Design a protein around this ligand. Structure first.
Ligand SMILES: *C/C=C1/C(=C/c2[nH]c(/C=C3[NH+]=C(/C=C4\NC(=O)C(C=C)=C4C)C(C)=C\3CCC(=O)O)c(CCC(=O)O)c2C)NC(=O)[C@H]1C
Ligand SMILES: *C/C=C1/C(=C/c2[nH]c(/C=C3[NH+]=C(/C=C4\NC(=O)C(C=C)=C4C)C(C)=C\3CCC(=O)O)c(CCC(=O)O)c2C)NC(=O)[C@H]1C
Lengths: 493, 493
């Protein structure tokens, strides 16, 4: 939301780390060379300071060197594989045999009218992992398999699988770690470590790299593009050096190289596969392609595994679910058909309390707060626009919800019909649970915070069951209105 | 549903082709050798007739040869990578350097307590295609890209992308074909070509092969497994020879080699990637892995592309959709709020007629059949159990629906609430459209059948819009019942 740091950016503090433009840093890592040329002219417009040393040509010779002579054979392939107007996610990787360096790696992605050239040095078990990931019984089983496969392929010290909760909080679900280092498995980190701007950037560009955290980046001369005199968009460039403050934060943990692979499910960021190395370690591209393959495989397989796990969790509860669905879809008066203990809707969701608000009057079951608190909760629920309200913490959402915590801390509510006039409420008592939070900060050890007023997190199977119950109750709403309209007509005339 | 052909199977006719067990044919292709051994003992139980020639050992020596001596180093990996009880989809591929053949391909998948060994001979653009598939603007654009990539990788004569309609009918959406052969693009084939048993088998095993249609298969001695004296499940074996009648059917078209890659979306078969070759052409495994990679990439990318295409189709219609959603969610009397031409719900779905059945009385718009036909259609809709009924053909579904075809051939109906008491009906006039059907049969030329009494197929965006409209109307049903209950109470007392 601000101009770039090198050309009019505000001073970077902890609070405004979300305002720092990381996609346009104006610098690249020193492990490769970057060239920028027009996609229609073929003349290099922007170059890196290390480009002259990397290519072996003098900087004066580099200026004005046409890409046709620069790339004797890759130019027709560059035009054919990258027509103008393609999305920035389209990358073309070709192995150009530069005589000075022998075999060299070339990767090009087009942003607007500019062609960005990325130059990097370059020189069977993947199918077994391909089949192993697809045979994971559950999501948790898949995590260690994927992390171990990544560690075997790369050799990184701490191969960690990063998972993001819906509230933009990250938790570690797996860790392939070399013996000796402290295990970070189970730690949950806040949203401050990964800004929302990264999440916006992370879904479009899945793989990144950091050759060395102690290596100083090099600038691009000229800094601004000659075409538009604007900051150069370097978001899609792997050679782009990450944020210097993030570099220092990584240095605080003594990490030389840090690679992260994004996992995108249904167009939204699901998690990361972070890797750390004590010593700097450049990565050949032919296995970075393998890492991208693994990332896509993981993104597909986590969806499949969540579907299977939801089906299995629902499998435990057909008798309760089928019984309540049969006993609620054909109920003319749900008050007398849902409040009986025979159905036992309280135990279906494993909740301490339940509110039956139908026909205006509300009937409560189990552990419920005093009546004025019930009316306050009902009014607050009516203020909620969403049809289904799910929360494991009424204390944070409701301004003084800690008072209800002795009776109910977590809440799952479904609104029959719409407008919250007729709603079902599930009340979950508070459970004192502590989750370790990691610790720019310098503490990266175990730190458990005594955590106030949440309940047991709602399983996705429970949410699916709530959605199904709401759907069937809203379906029975039609028969309810039909019979009440018959009564209206018969009693009016 | 029947015993195997070689040991008590009924004679194979055109009608009972769905009863032929293809997963247990008892024979394999002659391009490789198959060994079957116990997963706990290590002794080969079943072998192929060609196994002795392939391995270079006499059949007497082959019998009783322990896998530990047979595989000096792969046995510990076989046990580690294949624990007992794993699903049949788990395959372990290892390159065993057999001295007789030099480099040999070994692939093992476990079914029950038996270990099936598959032996086959063996000796950078994939990432570019990886990125090309992800950058396809639409599903149709992705099809030619995928087919061309497959043709470039393999070199097959006719690389065809096969797509299955929800009614188990297949249509060709792309074709990468060598110059000279007749293009099969656009042809639609019935469900007889691919039996439902194949569809059940095709979702679990994605890739198959046929080295030569004129090559006679070889049997396994003994035919039955020594462990259970039962037919050997060869469904997961690539070396399994396909159905001989299917071999003859493929021979009718003069195809030497025929490979098909399954596309599975959300656990159900979405389509196939069929390839045909005039001459036999065995396929090295290191590129069959690439083909599997492409199949998984296609399965993910078709989901993404359908989501994007549905979003784009809905993008055209916010004004109509937002206007009707605002004007229907807060309607106390939908009869006077939905029947006005200002909303123009007829043009939103591009339909020739519409029925507004609320409060018992039904109001019709546009081209509608005579009243007795309307009552018959309403009763038939009430007989339908599903909440949403979608069909482009009322002629087939409704026993004498061709009479309504002059007024409406296709129908899209949404039931407000449940029980079809209050429903919305969209009526689509008949359009005379012809789609070529290909032609075991011997005709594989152009054949267009004059096709009776269907309308324009319902776009997925239209179905999503219908679902959203039904959801919002069922939500407004709650306010309807609330106000009518207030009226009931106020007029009763
Ligand atoms: C307020 C801003 C902050 C900040 C900036 C920042 N961080 C990233 C990217 C990452 N942050 C991560 C966080 C962690 N690293 C760890 O080692 C642990 C725990 C052990 C955590 C929670 C991670 C993993 C990344 C991804 C980078 C990688 O590892 O490859 C960015 C995005 C930069 C880019 O994409 O180039 C930014 C701007 N980091 C903070 O900690 C706060 C102060
Ligand atoms: C009533 C049974 C029949 C039958 C049996 C059958 N067919 C398959 C598999 C396939 N059938 C296909 C159909 C076509 N082949 C073509 O060339 C065309 C059109 C140009 C069509 C529509 C295809 C493509 C397959 C997949 C095989 C491949 O190409 O690799 C099976 C399954 C066998 C197995 O999985 O091993 C069976 C039992 N085929 C018929 O045509 C009818 C008479």
């Amino acid at each position: 939301f601000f101009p770039p740091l090198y050309l009019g950016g505000p001073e970077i503090t902890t609070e405004n780390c979300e305002r720092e433009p990381i996609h346009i840093p104006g610098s690249i890592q020193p492990h490769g060379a970057l060239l920028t040329a027009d996609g229609h002219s073929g003349e290099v417009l922007q170059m890196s300071l290390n480009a002259a040393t990397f290519l072996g040509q003098e900087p004066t010779v580099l200026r004005g060197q046409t890409l046709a002579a620069l790339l004797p054979e890759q130019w027709p392939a560059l035009q054919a594989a990258l027509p103008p107007g393609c999305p920035d996610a389209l990358q073309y990787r070709a192995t150009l045999d530069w005589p000075a360096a022998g075999h060299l790696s070339l990767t090009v992605h087009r942003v607007g009218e500019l062609l960005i050239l990325e130059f990097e040095p370059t020189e069977h078990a993947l199918r077994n992992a391909m089949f192993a990931l697809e045979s994971a019984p559950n999501l948790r089983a898949l995590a260690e398999v994927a992390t171990q496969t990544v560690r075997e392929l790369t050799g990184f010290d701490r191969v960690m699988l990063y998972k993001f909760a819906p509230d933009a909080t990250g938790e570690v679900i797996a860790e392939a770690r070399r013996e000796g280092l402290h295990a970070f498995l189970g730690h949950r980190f806040p949203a401050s470590d990964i800004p929302a701007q990264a999440r916006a950037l992370y879904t479009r560009h899945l793989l990144r790299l950091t050759a060395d955290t102690r290596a100083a980046a090099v600038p691009l001369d000229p800094v601004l593009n000659p075409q538009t005199n604007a900051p150069t968009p370097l978001g899609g460039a792997v050679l782009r050096a990450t944020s210097p403050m993030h570099m220092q934060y990584l240095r605080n943990m003594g990490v030389g190289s840090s690679l992260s692979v994004s996992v995108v499910v249904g167009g939204q960021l699901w998690g990361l596969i972070a890797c750390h190395h004590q010593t700097p370690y450049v990565l050949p591209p032919d296995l970075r392609t393998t890492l991208e393959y693994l990332g896509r495989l993981l993104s597909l397989q986590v969806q499949v595994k969540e579907a299977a796990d939801v089906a299995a969790f629902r499998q435990s509860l057909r008798e309760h679910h089928a019984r309540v669905a049969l006993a609620a879809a054909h109920s003319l008066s749900p008050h007398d058909t849902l409040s009986d203990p025979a159905l036992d809707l309280l135990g279906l969701m494993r909740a301490g309390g339940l509110i039956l608000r139908f026909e205006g009057r509300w009937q409560t079951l189990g552990e419920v707060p005093p009546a004025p608190a019930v009316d306050a909760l009902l009014a607050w629920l009516e203020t909620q626009p969403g049809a289904l309200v799910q929360t494991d913490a009424l204390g944070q959402l409701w301004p003084a919800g800690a008072d209800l915590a002795p009776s109910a801390a977590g809440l799952l509510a479904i609104s029959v019909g719409e407008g919250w006039s007729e709603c079902l409420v599930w009340l979950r008592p508070e459970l004192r649970l502590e989750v370790a939070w990691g610790g720019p900060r310098h503490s990266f050890d175990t730190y458990l915070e005594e955590k106030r007023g949440y309940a047991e997190p709602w399983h996705p199977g429970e949410i699916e069951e709530a959605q199904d119950l709401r759907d069937t109750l809203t379906g029975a709403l039609g028969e309810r209105l039909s019979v009440i309209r018959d009564l209206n007509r018969a009693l009016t005339q």
